[model samples]
Target: MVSTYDEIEIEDMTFEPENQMFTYPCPCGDRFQIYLDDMFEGEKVAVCPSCSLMIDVVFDKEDLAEYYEEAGIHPPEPIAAAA
Candidate 1:
């Protein structure tokens, strides 16, 4: 069975940082790697190296909300406003 986004929480996913890249696997079968800033904060972007598609990797809820807004994805009601 395919995993749903809700079924696999991003918080449960492990983060691997090496050199200048942070990598993780998404429930969508996409592998992502993002370049980090000097502070180790994600640089507001991620990319599926396998697909060459740019992705948004928000570490906090405010950023996630912003990303959802930018992506035109409406967040569910009564959701956590901050991560």
Candidate 2:
């Protein structure tokens, strides 16, 4: 099973429109990072680069539109097929 240190709301993280990235403070003196695009693509873990800490990002897919707008990017097209 995948392990995460904690569950964090997307609202609790810092959003950087310049790079379309989100970040949260990590205990190891480094910030945990995850891209907004990655989140939209179904990635929910924010990883700290300097250590092994990671957290689950809590958010709804529909809520990503505003963030995407802030980044001046379009939301991803929904996939319509599975085989």
Candidate 3:
């Protein structure tokens, strides 16, 4: 079973950067830390040191719209602005 989000896609598990911790709930019950190579850019890439699973983070459409607005770049398609 995998969880999907309307705004973002979360990998089957979560990895914590603060302590270099990784935990996926029971059944699979795997726990380990990932080591990253120099190529690893934190905000752009989420990687596992133990398994070397490289995950990319993608922003929501709306979130990206906001980001573009803040940066003064129009989104490919404009979203309705809040009043």
What are the per-residue Cα lDDT tens digits for candidate 1 across 1-66?
222122222344444423433457754577655433421454444444565444444554343333
- On TM-score, the stronger of 2 and 3 is 2
Query: Sort by lDDT, best first: what order?
Result: 2, 1, 3
Clashes of each: 0, 0, 4
Instruction: Give the better candidate number (1 or 3) by lDDT.
Output: 1
Q: Write the per-residue lDDT of candidate 2 for residues 1-83, one digit (tens) a residue.
A: 28877788877778767767777877788878777667777787756678877677787665466666557654457847678
> For residue 9, what is the lDDT in candidate 1?
28
- Ranked by TM-score from best down, the candidates are 2, 1, 3
- The residue pairs in collision within model 2 are none
lDDT of each: 0.44, 0.72, 0.37
Q: Model 1 — which ten-residue stretch has the worst lDDT? A: 1-10
Tens-digit per-residue lDDT, 45-80, candidate 3: 544455544444342234322333344433346678
Q: Give TM per candidate.
A: 0.35, 0.70, 0.25
